[PDB]
Every structure is written in structure tokens, then in C-alpha cells.
Amino acid sequence: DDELLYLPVRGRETYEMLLKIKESLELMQYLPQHTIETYRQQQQQ
Amino acid sequence: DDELLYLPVRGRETYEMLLKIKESLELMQYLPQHTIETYRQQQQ
Amino acid sequence: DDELLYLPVRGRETYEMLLKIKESLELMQYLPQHTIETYRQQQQQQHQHLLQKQTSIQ
Amino acid sequence: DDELLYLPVRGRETYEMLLKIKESLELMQYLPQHTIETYRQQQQQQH
């Protein structure tokens, strides 16, 4: 949830890819619950 | 520029992992770029 | 189940990123399960058993 | 090329997800490149 964990990565290219996915997953907590629904009602539209 | 594309997936479990990643990547566009920079600066 | 499903994606950049992740996840099925288990055991050991210590269920 | 880097992750769920992706990317080296081409050709056959 808030646990600080370290992921060992081999190479800059893999690191940059995992960093972009890590960021998107962590940034979801900075989104309002209304945005997360607005988008989800737009997905089935 | 955001077109609608369909990704064929083999397996339920792979589909679920990909769905969670797709949502988080697409939802980033609904964040102000200032919030993304505020977060990135806080990470370093 | 290993069924054919279609994931709708908005944007080329997200699609290409998902395409690369899908390929590596699907390509793992082309490896013997014994290779995957061995690789995972070798990963557990390294970095003062970091991946072992960071395992949630024990 | 394959420099050891540590990615700090906040949250168990994000960590487990990234760990599974990292593993799949690293395990691809254990595949013969003929298998990767066979798979890619088979993917554009059902497209």
C-alpha cells in the first residue's frame, strides 16, 4: 500500500520501461474517484 | 492524437494484468502535467 | 483460461507499450516451467536475498 | 548494457505487478530468437 520495496533491474532500457509503468500505477492514487468513474463510463461508451 | 486500437490477448490472467496497466497509462492523460512533475520531483 | 480476448486501447503510445508487455508475458509460455522456477530461485538468492525478504507471504 | 539498477517502488500491489513484468522481460533471453520470430509471425497471421 505504502511499503517501500526495491526492484533490482538489469539495464537502463528495462529500468526506463518499468519506471513509466511504476509511475502510471503510483499516480493513480493522485486521481479523484470521480475521474476514475468518468473515464470508466467513457470506456463502455 | 489518440486512436482506438484492439490488442488480441491469449489468456484471462494476461488480459487482467494488461487491463490494469492500460487503465493506469490512459488515466495519466487525465492528470495535469504539473501533478506528474510534482510527483516526479518528489520521487528524486 | 487461455482464451482469445480483445483489449481496446486509446493511443498508439499506450498500445505499443502494451504490445511489448503482452509479448514478453505470452512468450514466457514458450519456456519450460522448470526454466522459470530455476530462474526465480536464482533471483531470490541474489542481492543479500532481497526478493526473499521482500516476499509478502512469509 | 545490463547494469544493476534499483527501482524504488511504493506499494506491494505495484511491486508485484512490476516484478512479474521484469521476470518476463528477463526470461526472454532464455528463448531462442527463432521462437520469438515464430510467435511474432503467428501473431500477424490472426491479425
Minimum distance, in Å, between the CA of residue C46 and any CA atom of chain D: 11
Comparing CA positions, the residue from D34, B2, D36 lying closest to residue C9 is: B2
Hey, is the C-beta of D3 within 8 angstroms of any chain A C-beta? Answer: yes
Q: How many other C-beta atoms lie within 10 A of the C-beta of residue A38?
A: 12
* CA-to-CA separations, D33 to B37, C27, D28, D40, in angstroms, rounded: 39, 11, 9, 11
Element (H, E) at C10: strand C4-10
Which residues in chain C are contacts of B21 at CB distance < 8 A? Answer: 17-18, 21
Residues of D in contact with A19 (CB under 8 A): 7
Distance CA C20, CA B4 (A): 18
- Name residues whose C-beta falls within 8 Å of residue B35's C-beta, 6 or more positions apart in sequence: A27, A30
Q: A25 to chain B nearest CA, in Å?
A: 5
Contact B9, B18 (CB under 8 A): yes
Contacts 24+ apart (CB under 8 A), B30-36: B30/A31, B30/A35, B30/A38, B30/A39, B31/A27, B31/A30, B31/A31, B35/A27, B35/A30, B36/A23, B36/A27
DSSP string, B1-44: ---EEEEEEESHHHHHHHHHHHHHHHHGGGS-HHHHHHHHHHH-
Beta carbons within 8 Å of A3's beta carbon, 6+ residues apart? D10, D11, D12, D15
Q: Does A17 sit within 8 Å of C20, measured CB to CB?
A: yes
All residues at 6 or more sequence positions from B8 whose CB lies less than 8 Å from its CB, including other chains: C4, C5, C6, C7, D43, D46, D47
CB of B26 less than 8 A from some CB of C: yes
Domains recognised in chain D with CATH numbers: 1-47 (4.10.170.10)
Q: What are phi and psi of B2, to 5 degrees?
A: -140, 95
Per the structure block, which three cell numbers stand in for B22?
A: 492500460
With an 8 Å Cβ cutoff, are B35 and A23 in contact?
A: no
Contact residues, chain A, for D11 at CB < 8 Å: 1-3, 25-26
